[PDB]
Design a protein around this nucleic acid. Structure first.
Lengths: 30, 124, 181, 24, 78
RNA sequence: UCGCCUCCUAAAAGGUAACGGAGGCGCCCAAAGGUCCCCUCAGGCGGGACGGAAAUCCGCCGGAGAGCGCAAGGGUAGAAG
RNA sequence: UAAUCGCAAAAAGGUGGGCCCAGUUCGGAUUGGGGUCUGCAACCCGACCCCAUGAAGCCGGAAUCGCUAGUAAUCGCGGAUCA
């Protein structure tokens, strides 16, 4: 299902996965 | 609560929890808690998502820190394989590098006792 | 959805760049991902009476497909177990699902690898297509530190139209693969 | 304890002063 | 840990400085194992004494703060 | 040594002796059987976290040297696998 | 030129705060990085102070030492030698 990733680097990415609830400790912006 | 890479403390008072990082001890801990202005008596259990980010901001950005800290010291011991200083050896023979008595202890740098012996005295 | 970022990126960005770099005449000559087959080895699970069906139902969250339950073809006393009831865990991703997986992997997962300086640039070798292997499976978003118990790595093969690894290297680097120059 | 050089008792037993045992 | 000064021998620096005068060769005996390796004095191989012999040791930039005796170990097979 | 099976001896049909050369059998499978429908090997060279020199994964090259419970021979992937 | 000033703080204790049975805030070896001081000179080889390391040890096999009262245990202090 469609998902919403949330970085500690502010950035929000729009992929699709299992469960949209996503806490990221920094993506590839860092 | 994964501040440094593979490292995650939890349900303990944060002050000493942060100890559970390579590159962070009681000192660099307290130092950071006033600067983030957070009560250390509080647990990793409980805190704002803001508190968390505020803490990992200050820490991970300032100094280093498992991985490339660990990898750094090694390259320094490596460089003592120049033409070969005194501290270069001792690292080469796994012996005390810091001017000590090998004749007896040293067991911390030498794996437990290789008793290996077969000495003799008088039969007849 | 039938469209994702990378998928778009490929067409409206990378597709052309490559046509400009290497001068292809036909749309099809332009290299494209074929598939990304991902696999776990699992030397245990055999023994300690280990059902270990923990890995597939877990893997399914990250990859989005129920993985397939692969088994040993010889008997090796030396390295244990005897052909059959044996172990290994493999899933094949094409189209959207392929894309969604790479999207996340590159944009998120490789970020929280323990060390990292870039992906090894010696894992095509002419033989088009690229392999790499991982250690921790919790580096993905869907996996949580609560969920784990043992840290099972995996191998990722990604297969392409490119006949040389020159033109395949470009494709991956431009899709957003950080290589250890 | 009586050798943790980062402590009250550590400095005491050694008989020196520092951060972890302030000189007056 | 000399922190104001470099405890480094006279007979040495005068010797490398009048060899710096147009930068000639290098065959240099010494017993100043007690002294620090000076910046740029690279190339110049110094035969340092260790109680028995003058060991012919070569020099480079990465090594600097180290003493010359720190490249003439004194005992044999550990 | 004594019955049975494979090969050679056996002189291009069959058959062919010797205390000639050299091996197997006295079991096994409720699926290792019937039919229908799918699938194709051993190696070799890359490439890939734990991983050997073949554990599982990817890619090329590979008409058969794989495999077909067990000895040998025959046969066999356009399947007997 | 010293019961007239200094080493100097005795420590355990007492008060109230923190850890919650964890190889841990137990334990401080090993090692890296950074400094101070004595000395002509701390590479072999000094002791300190700080940042980072946090090793073996969950009370010790056969053995075996000391002590009968201000003792045994346990805590800290001075002095000789001497930069």
């Amino acid at each position: 299902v469609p998902a919403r990733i949330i970085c500690g680097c502010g950035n929000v990415i729009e992929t699709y996965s299992t469960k949209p609830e996503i806490y990221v400790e920094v993506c590839s912006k860092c | 609560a994964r501040i440094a890479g593979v490292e995650i403390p939890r349900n303990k008072r944060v002050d000493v929890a942060l100890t559970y990082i390579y590159g962070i001890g009681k000192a660099r801990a307290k130092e950071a808690l006033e600067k983030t202005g957070i009560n250390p008596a509080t647990r990793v259990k409980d805190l704002t998502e803001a508190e968390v980010v505020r803490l990992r901001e200050y820490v991970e950005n300032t100094w280093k820190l498992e991985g490339e800290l660990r990898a750094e010291v090694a390259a320094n011991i490596k460089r003592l394989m120049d033409i070969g200083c005194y501290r270069g050896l001792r690292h080469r023979r796994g012996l005390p590098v810091r001017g000590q008595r090998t004749r007896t202890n040293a067991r911390t740098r030498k794996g437990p006792r290789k008793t290996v012996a077969g000495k003799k005295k008088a039969p007849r | 959805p039938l469209d994702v970022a990378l998928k778009r990126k490929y067409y409206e960005e990378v597709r052309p760049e490559l046509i400009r770099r290497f001068g292809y005449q036909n749309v099809w000559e332009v290299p494209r991902l074929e598939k990304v087959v991902i696999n776990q080895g699992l030397g245990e699970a055999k023994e300690d009476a280990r059902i270990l069906e923990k890995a597939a139902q877990e893997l399914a969250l990250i990859t989005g497909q129920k993985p397939a339950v692969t088994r040993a073809k010889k008997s090796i006393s030396n390295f244990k177990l005897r052909k059959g009831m044996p172990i290994g865990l493999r899933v094949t991703l094409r189209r959207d699902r392929m894309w969604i997986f790479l999207e996340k992997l590159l944009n998120v997962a490789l970020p929280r690898i323990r060390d990292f300086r870039g992906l090894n640039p010696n894992s095509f070798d002419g033989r088009g297509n690229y392999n790499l292997g991982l250690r921790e499976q919790l580096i993905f978003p869907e996996i949580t530190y609560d969920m784990v118990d043992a840290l099972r790595g995996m191998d990722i093969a990604v297969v392409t139209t490119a006949e040389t690894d020159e033109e395949a290297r470009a494709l991956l680097e431009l899709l957003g693969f950080p290589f250890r120059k | 304890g009586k050798g943790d050089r980062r402590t009250r008792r550590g400095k005491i037993w050694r008989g020196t002063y520092g951060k972890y045992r302030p000189r007056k | 840990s000399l922190k104001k000064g470099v405890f480094v021998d006279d007979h040495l620096l005068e010797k490398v400085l009048e060899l710096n005068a147009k930068g000639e060769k290098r065959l240099i005996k010494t017993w100043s194992r007690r002294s620090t390796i000076v910046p740029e004095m690279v190339g110049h191989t110094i035969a340092v004494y260790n109680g028995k012999q003058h060991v012919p040791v070569y020099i480079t930039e990465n090594m600097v703060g180290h003493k010359l005796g720190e490249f003439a170990p004194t005992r044999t097979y550990r």
